[PDB]
Amino acid sequence: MSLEVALFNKWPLTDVKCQDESLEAYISIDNHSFVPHSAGRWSAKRFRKAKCPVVERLTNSLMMHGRNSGKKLMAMKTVGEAFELINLYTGKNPVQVLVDAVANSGPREDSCRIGKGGQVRRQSVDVSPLRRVNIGIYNIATGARKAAFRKVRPFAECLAEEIMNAAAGADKSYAISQRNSVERIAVSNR
RNA sequence: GGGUAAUUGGCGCAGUUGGUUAGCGCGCGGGUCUCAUAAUCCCGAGCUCGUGAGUUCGAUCCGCACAUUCCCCA
Numbered sequence: 086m087s088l089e090v091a092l093f094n095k096w097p098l099t100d101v102k103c104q105d106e107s108l109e110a111y112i113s114i115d116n117h118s119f120v121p122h123s124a125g126r127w128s129a130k131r132f133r134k135a136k137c138p139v140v141e142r143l144t145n146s147l148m149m150h151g152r153n154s155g156k157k158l159m160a161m162k163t164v165g166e167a168f169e170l171i172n173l174y175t176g177k178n179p180v181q182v183l184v185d186a187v188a189n190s191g192p193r194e195d196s197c198r199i200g201k202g203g204q205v206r207r208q209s210v211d212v213s214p215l216r217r218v219n220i221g222i223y224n225i226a227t228g229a230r231k232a233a234f235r236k237v238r239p240f241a242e243c244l245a246e247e248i249m250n251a252a253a254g255a256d257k258s259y260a261i262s263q264r265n266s267v268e269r270i271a272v273s274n275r
Numbered sequence: 276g277g278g279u280a281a282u283u284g285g286c287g288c289a290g291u292u293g294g295u296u297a298g299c300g301c302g303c304g305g306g307u308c309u310c311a312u313a314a315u316c317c318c319g320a321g322c323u324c325g326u327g328a329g330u331u332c333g334a335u336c337c338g339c340a341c342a343u344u345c346c347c348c349a
Contacts, residue, residue, distance in 0.1 A: 196306095198306095205313075207306085270313075
C-alpha cells in the first residue's frame with residue numbers, strides 16, 4: 086500500500102495470517118503501528134478489544150506484576166529482543182509464530198457451575214474465541230514470568246522459548262500443559 | 276511326619292520371563308467453611324538360598340512362621 090508498517094522497522098505485516106477460523110477475525114494483524122504504543126481507549130465497549138493489535142495486547146500483560154505496573158517501554162524493548170531471537174533461531178517472521186502460538190493455546194472446553202449443581206456438579210461447556218485468545222496470551226506471559234524469577238537468565242529468553250515451544254505444540258511448554266490439564270479435567274465432568 | 280494354599284508400601288487384596296502394581300492411607304493445593312467429589316504427590320531384602328533363562332513378586336529347588344485335613348510300637 087502507500088506505507089508498510091514494518092514493526093520496529095524490520096519485520097512486516099504483509100504475508101501474515103491465521104490458520105484457525107474460529108479466531109481468525111478476533112485477531113488484528115494489519116492495524117499495527119510501527120511501535121506497539123497506542124493511547125487508544127480500548128476496553129471501552131464490549132468487543133472493541135478484538136481490534137487491538139495483538140502485540141499491544143501481549144505487552145499490556147507483561148507488566149501484570151505489582152512491582153512492574155505502568156512500564157510499557159521496557160515491555161516493548163523486551164518484545165523486540167524476543168523477536169530478534171525468534172528470527173535467529175527460526176529464520177522466519179516472528180509474527181507468524183506468535184499468531185500460531187496464540188491459536189495453539191487456549192482451551193476448547195472448560196468446566197462451570199450450571200443450574201444448581203449441588204455437591205460439586207460441574208458440567209462441560211465450550212468456549213468463545215475471545216476468551217481463547219485472552220487465556221492464550223495470559224498463559225504465555227505467565228509461563229515466561231514463572232521461569233525467570235530467582236533465575237539467572239532474563240525474561241526475554243524465557244519469553245521467546247515459551248513462544249516457540251507453544252507454536253510447536255510441545256507439551257514441554259507451560260501453556261500447553263495447562264490447556265491439556267483443563268481440557269482433560271473438563272472431559273471427566275462431561 | 277504327609278498333603279493343600281498363602282507371607283507383597285503403613286493397611287488388607289488383583290497382578291506372574293518386558294507396569295512395582297490397584298485401592299485404602301501421609302501432606303501440601305483448588306473446588307462460596309470445604310468434606311462425600313476431583314488433581315497431584317509419597318510409602319517396598321514382594322519370607323529365604325541355589326536354579327536356568329535377555330529379563331522373574333513372578334519359573335524349579337533350599338529352609339522357616341500361620342491355616343485345614345490325616346497318620347502314630349524305642
